Structures are given as structure tokens and as C-alpha cells.
């Protein structure tokens, strides 16, 4: 497929948009300018920005040998470019980058099981809707970083990667994952970003001995979660904006939580009774100095919100809301703590009470 050189750029790359971008990469003023192999050899990166390039025209890159190119960056692209091709003329490619275009999920991209880029180190496709699944890569043994945030990835599209043993960073934030694999073969993984997914738990990871940062902010973790037994390198576990009533005790010293919500059990009491709750997370946060303010408040929510006297029982680790003056009926109660009026943060727990 290699076009004979020397030749005009437009003859080597017979597509208006591709030729324009190649002239810019080659620092030639015109697509009519004649290039030779030395001009190609001077390139160490290729940038693309003309949105008329399509899958078919990008394939024309196989007509030229790029002996020294290690980076491909696609900064702007149209709807007819949905894949960077697996061509044989960029043998030393190390980084592949697609920009996150303006707007939300406006472009679609597929991720081939690339075979001709054995030196690939980093792939970034964040912000683009993934077409199909992420392949269980077989041709990129040196892959170290994978940025795949905001791509509408579901758990059926994410394999338990078998052949990328050097992976260090995996960013899957802002997707629709309901489960995450108990990753078997990425033991060098140090950073796992899962914020803004739909997770309800994770496995008690069996082989992540080097993981230092695990971000689970804004998921659906509810009540209790797995109490990790084998994350010896863990430094930060972000559980902010979940629905836990208790934090995992084995890793409590790594946790970031300032806001949290939750539901406590229904109770039935008699008119004149107070109402006492368990709230393990409050006591954990209090005792490990995670609170920014000390007050614990209670209220009931009807036509208006009415505050109730609320006391913390530190010996028995319970909280009592004084419901003794309420008449019989059905009530929605709330206990809140860690109020941060400056930031909008709060930890707030709701439950229903029947008073007979
Ligand atoms: Ca000229
Ligand atoms: Ca532009
Ligand atoms: Ca070289
Ligand atoms: Ca975007
Ligand atoms: Ca999908
Ligand atoms: Ca395996
Ligand atoms: Ca106590
Ligand atoms: Ca509430
Ligand atoms: Cl030549």
C-alpha cells in the first residue's frame, strides 16, 4: 500500500481533510507540496482536527511509513470517524488520544483489539459513547493507562482483562457499571476511578496488592459494603455520596466521606415514646475525627419540617429523637450530622415511624 515518494501530499493522502491535517503535521504550507521519506521520518506525532475525515479516509495513513511517530491525537472529529484504524505503518505508536468533544456524548467510538501497536502505553477515549465492548486486549502487552470515562459503559462491556499485566491506571468514571470484575490479572493496578457509576458493592478484591487509590464516590453503595481484606497498599477510598449506614472497618483510616445519605429501619412506637436509632457511621466518623461540625439534629417532615430534640448516647452508640409529644399517625423522621453550610455537605438518614 505504500505510495511512491517523492510525491505531493495530496497524492500520498488523497482526501481533502486528511491532506490538510498532514500538511499541518509536516509544516508544509500546501497540500500540493512535495514530500519525501525524510519529511515523514521527522514526524514524532500526528494530530488530526478536520472533521470531514472518516474511517475510510483515516485508513489512507497506511500509504505512508511513519517510522518515528509515537503519538496520535485526534483533537476534533466528525460523526463519520468512529475508529482509529489498526494499520501497519505506525509500528512505534505509544499513545492514542481522542478528545472529549463539546457537549455530552455527542460522538461514538469503537475500540479495536489492536494488533499493530504492540508498544501502546496509554489510550484515552473519555467523553465518547463506546460502540460495543472493550476488548480483552491480546496485542498490547505494554499497556499501562486506560482512560475510558463517560462512555456509557455497562458491566457486560468490561472484561476481566487477561493480557495487560502492566496496567497501572484505569479510569471508568461516569459510566453505568452495576458490578466491577474481581480483577484477576492486573496486579500492578494503582489507581482505579469508578466515581459516578451504579455500583451496589465491589468484590473483596483478590489480586490488587498495589492499589493505592479507589474512588467510589457517587455510586449506589447501600447499608454496608464489603470490608476489604487484601488491599495492603490502600491510601484513599472515596465513599462520598453513597448510602452507607456503616463504613468498612478494615480500611477506615483511608476513607473520604463528608456527605452520605441513608434509610434506617421502620419503627412502631406508642404515643409518648421517644425513638432511638443505631447509626454506626456517625460513631465511626466522630471517633476518627472526620467531622467538620459536632451537632447532631433531628426533625420530622410533614406539611412543614419541624425540629425535634435529639441526643447522642455515647456509651451504647445510639441516637434518641424526642418524639414523645407527637400524636398518633405516620411520620417521616430525619437525623442529620456533619452539616457544612459553607459547602452544602451533610450526612442525613431517614426512616418511617408509626405512632400508635
Ligand atoms: Ca509550495
Ligand atoms: Ca478547528
Ligand atoms: Ca526511531
Ligand atoms: Ca463532552
Ligand atoms: Ca455501552
Ligand atoms: Ca484470568
Ligand atoms: Ca461510643
Ligand atoms: Ca434526609
Ligand atoms: Cl523519498
Residue numbers in the entry: 33 to 388
Quote the study's own text.
Using pregnant guinea pigs, which have a placental structure that closely resembles humans, we identified a protein (InlP) secreted by the bacterial pathogen Listeria monocytogenes that strongly promotes placental infection. Recently, we used an unbiased genetic screen in a pregnant guinea pig model of listeriosis to identify L. monocytogenes genes that contribute specifically to infection of the placenta.. One gene identified in this screen encodes InlP, a member of the internalin family of proteins. While most internalins are predicted to be anchored to the bacterial cell surface via attachment to the peptidoglycan cell wall or to lipoteichoic acids, four of them, including InlP, lack obvious anchoring domains and are predicted to be secreted by the bacterium. Here, we solved the crystal structure of InlP, and identified Afadin, a cytoplasmic protein that localizes to adherens junctions as a binding partner of InlP. In this work, we identify the host cell cytoplasmic protein afadin as a major binding partner for InlP, and demonstrate that the InlP-afadin interaction specifically enhances L. monocytogenes transcytosis—that is, the ability of L. monocytogenes to exit from the basal face of an infected polarized epithelial monolayer, consistent with its potential contribution to placental infection. We demonstrate that InlP decreases the magnitude of traction stresses epithelial cells exert on an underlying extracellular matrix, and furthermore, that InlP facilitates bacterial spread from infected epithelial monolayers into an underlying compartment. In human placental organ cultures bacteria deficient in InlP were impaired in their ability to spread from infected placental cytotrophoblasts into the underlying fetal stroma.
Listeria monocytogenes is a well-characterized food-borne pathogen capable of placental crossing and is thus ideal for probing this barrier. Pathogenic L. monocytogenes strains contain genes for 25 known members of this protein family, which share a common overall structure that includes a secretory signal sequence at the N-terminus and a large leucine-rich repeat (LRR) domain, a motif frequently implicated in protein-protein interactions. The two best-characterized internalins, InlA and InlB, contribute to L. monocytogenes invasion of epithelial cells and hepatocytes by binding to their cognate host cell surface receptors, E-cadherin and c-Met respectively.
